[PDB]
């Protein structure tokens, strides 16, 4: 459990880069603040999909 | 023929029924197409992808 | 887009047509109470800024 | 225990103003956020007791679409302003107030004839604007105690043809709640992800504070449930 | 909004637009049924004339 | 089974050898999760023959795609069986119909 | 008069169409409270009703669910799936061990389970398996425990009970006894008044909960949840 608390501490304001191939233009890679979620699927904001 | 088979089952001919939101109990403002569809699981499982 | 479009459309005769509203808050109250439809043509007091 | 549930341990109140408050409760059992929020929202919108202005008579006005000289606002805007009048009455179930004034400038709630059993929340509230020294306004307003919101279109009946000249009908905003909204977000307790956090954004007239409104709505619901509860 | 007010109000506006659109699309109960594909009654005679 | 099918489900399920198809008619004499024993009809067995057919079912074997291949009986004791009848359902089969 | 004095509902009638299907009538209800109570009670009933479910099964000679037993028509996995649907009402314990010994050709159903005095089988006809040989015998030991909600075995292993033997099989537990909840609001012409309403709640369950007890428990949960709002600063 303390490992999970540490992980919550380390990701607080640490951005991560999300990239979808093909990276046709520079919006193909964008930074997001990660919120830790259960499950194995990345959750993407609907407005960035376009 | 689909309409007649629905009529035999006492179901609406249009294929749309009045649904209620379980979160609030409120009626959805328009009738909704509710039926049965045959769905598949396509071997592209996330736990093989993560 | 569909939800905003459905929100911002008008109907010729709708529940609560012709009401005069103190502001947007009263419109929200009337809608959630079921006393008025989203498409009801009404006169609403609006404060805007420039 | 199978009969033991999670009762909120973190309660936060953010007072944006004396009338606006944001109340956040966590943690809640999965789905309890929507249940509690929607129940409270319905009770606050449609069942909260309160006092509001219902009928208005103006001397120079015969119908709601009649014009009057000396008043900047049309009669419809005056009716809206009277809808915005927050008033609380002690003991009495129905009161009638009289407003007479002459003078260039705003005609506000502070000009209404005072009654010991009636209290006005915002004297600064503007009822109309008088445009000339040769202009006078005289009106009689009716304040009743009721629940929720009853539009004037519900009360316009041929059975009420007893209405004399100029008995204008005003939407009755009995409930103090001006806006009630709720949002449900995620919460966790020891990596127990499936939990609910409830955020309640409440704005009310100055009749009662938002916290008092929430307490009264919860009291109403609990009293409704009392005949089925088998515990303390 | 971006040209008049800048970046931060635009971001908040975009999030609120998304939330409101999703909520009211859900409340609308918009659905596609077989009866929504309305065929003109003139179609058969147009085909016959052609 | 698909409630809305096209009628080709039976052919796909039978022609594919995932199902145990009775090669001779008769009456089923023994059933369990792994074995079906059929007593062949008198007018259908050859001279000098025991007159019994034994079908051994594939139980929980690995497919090429690491999925499960399992055969389950769809018959019960004493039930008549004709030639071509499906005796056991295979993966994605329900009473001899393809069930994806 | 008495605008602030709401009328309080009571359980006026309970109708039981079948052992699994019932209707409960609440009357009287002020305008608008019928829908509020109906939806709140529906959510609470579908989410939080206690019940008993099968959790573990031990069958002699069976090491894992991906195997077959000689003389048994069904696979062990199908037997466990059938056992997942067993409706058991336990009177005074949160866990109980049931025994099922059967021999000879025929269906093996819930009526064949050796019964404790404080265990009730709602549906004896429920088929557990089929024996297809005279020398075939089934000896089974089932663990039924009381719980709330849906607890899959994958999450159940988090209990970390050390050294579970090989022959022990875990069944996903669906403790919820309710299956379908509907509510209708009608006009209740009572007390010489016209604006009162009546709430009819129709419930289909597995037969392991008294409908009145379920309604009262839902109301109790709702009241306990409201206690935080009533007392808030």
UniProtKB/Swiss-Prot annotation, chain A:
Spell out the subunit comment: The RNAP catalytic core consists of 2 alpha, 1 beta, 1 beta' and 1 omega subunit. When a sigma factor is associated with the core the holoenzyme is formed, which can initiate transcription. The rRNA transcription and antitermination complex (rrnTAC) consists of RNAP, NusA, NusB, NusE (rpsJ), NusG, SubB, ribosomal protein S4, DNA and precursor rRNA; S4 is more flexible than other subunits.
Taxonomic superkingdom: Bacteria
What this chain does, per the entry, is described as: DNA-dependent RNA polymerase (RNAP) catalyzes the transcription of DNA into RNA using the four ribonucleoside triphosphates as substrates. Resistance to the antibiotics salinamide A, salinamide B, rifampicin, streptolydigin, CBR703, myxopyronin, and lipiarmycin can result from mutations in this protein.
Biotech relevance: Co-administration of salinamide and rifampicin or salinamide and myxopyronin suppresses the emergence of resistance to both antibiotics.
Q: What is this protein called?
A: DNA-directed RNA polymerase subunit beta'
Modification after translation is described as: Acetylated on several lysine residues in the presence of glucose.
Q: Report the family membership.
A: Belongs to the RNA polymerase beta' chain family.
Q: Which residues cross the membrane?
A: none
Organism, by scientific name, is Escherichia coli (strain K12)
Q: Which residues form a coiled coil?
A: none
UniProtKB/Swiss-Prot annotation, chain B:
Q: Mark the residues carrying the PTM N6-acetyllysine.
A: 7
The record describes its post-translational modification as: Acetylated on several lysine residues in the presence of glucose.
Q: Biotechnological application?
A: Co-administration of salinamide and rifampicin or salinamide and myxopyronin suppresses the emergence of resistance to both antibiotics.
The task this protein performs is described as: DNA-dependent RNA polymerase (RNAP) catalyzes the transcription of DNA into RNA using the four ribonucleoside triphosphates as substrates. Resistance to the antibiotics salinamide A, salinamide B, rifampicin, streptolydigin, CBR703, myxopyronin, and lipiarmycin can result from mutations in this protein.
- Assembly information from the UniProt record: The RNAP catalytic core consists of 2 alpha, 1 beta, 1 beta' and 1 omega subunit. When a sigma factor is associated with the core the holoenzyme is formed, which can initiate transcription. The rRNA transcription and antitermination complex (rrnTAC) consists of RNAP, NusA, NusB, NusE (rpsJ), NusG, SubB, ribosomal protein S4, DNA and precursor rRNA; S4 is more flexible than other subunits. In pull-down experiments interacts with CedA. (Microbial infection) Interacts (via flap domain) with Escherichia phage lambda antitermination protein Q; this interaction renders bacterial RNAP resistant to transcription pausing and allows it to read through termination signals.
Query: Into which family does the record put it?
Result: Belongs to the RNA polymerase beta chain family.
Query: Coverage of the whole protein, first to last residue?
Result: 1194 to 1243 of 1342
UniProtKB/Swiss-Prot annotation, chain F:
Q: How is it used?
A: Co-administration of salinamide and rifampicin or salinamide and myxopyronin suppresses the emergence of resistance to both antibiotics.
Query: What organism is recorded for this protein?
Result: Escherichia coli (strain K12)
Oligomeric state and interaction partners are given as: The RNAP catalytic core consists of 2 alpha, 1 beta, 1 beta' and 1 omega subunit. When a sigma factor is associated with the core the holoenzyme is formed, which can initiate transcription. The rRNA transcription and antitermination complex (rrnTAC) consists of RNAP, NusA, NusB, NusE (rpsJ), NusG, SubB, ribosomal protein S4, DNA and precursor rRNA; S4 is more flexible than other subunits. In pull-down experiments interacts with CedA.
Instruction: Please state what the protein is called.
Output: DNA-directed RNA polymerase subunit beta
- Family listed: Belongs to the RNA polymerase beta chain family.
Q: What role is this protein assigned?
A: DNA-dependent RNA polymerase (RNAP) catalyzes the transcription of DNA into RNA using the four ribonucleoside triphosphates as substrates. Resistance to the antibiotics salinamide A, salinamide B, rifampicin, streptolydigin, CBR703, myxopyronin, and lipiarmycin can result from mutations in this protein.
Summarize what the UniProt record says about post-translational modification.
Answer: Acetylated on several lysine residues in the presence of glucose.
Q: What is the lineage of its organism?
A: Bacteria, Pseudomonadati, Pseudomonadota, Gammaproteobacteria, Enterobacterales
Swiss-Prot record, chain G:
Q: Is Transferase one of the keywords UniProt gives this record?
A: yes
Q: What's one GO BP annotation on this UniProt entry?
A: intracellular iron ion homeostasis
Briefly state the modifications made to the protein after translation.
Answer: (Microbial infection) ADP-ribosylated on both alpha subunits by the phage T4 protein ModA. ADP-ribosylated on only one of the alpha subunits by the phage T4 protein Alt.
Question: One MF term in GO for this entry?
Answer: protein dimerization activity
This protein's superkingdom?
A: Bacteria
Keyword set, alphabetical order = Acetylation, ADP-ribosylation, DNA-directed RNA polymerase, Nucleotidyltransferase, Transcription, Transferase
The name on file for this protein is DNA-directed RNA polymerase subunit alpha
Describe which stretch of the whole protein the shown chain covers, with first residue, last residue and complete length: 3 to 235 of 329
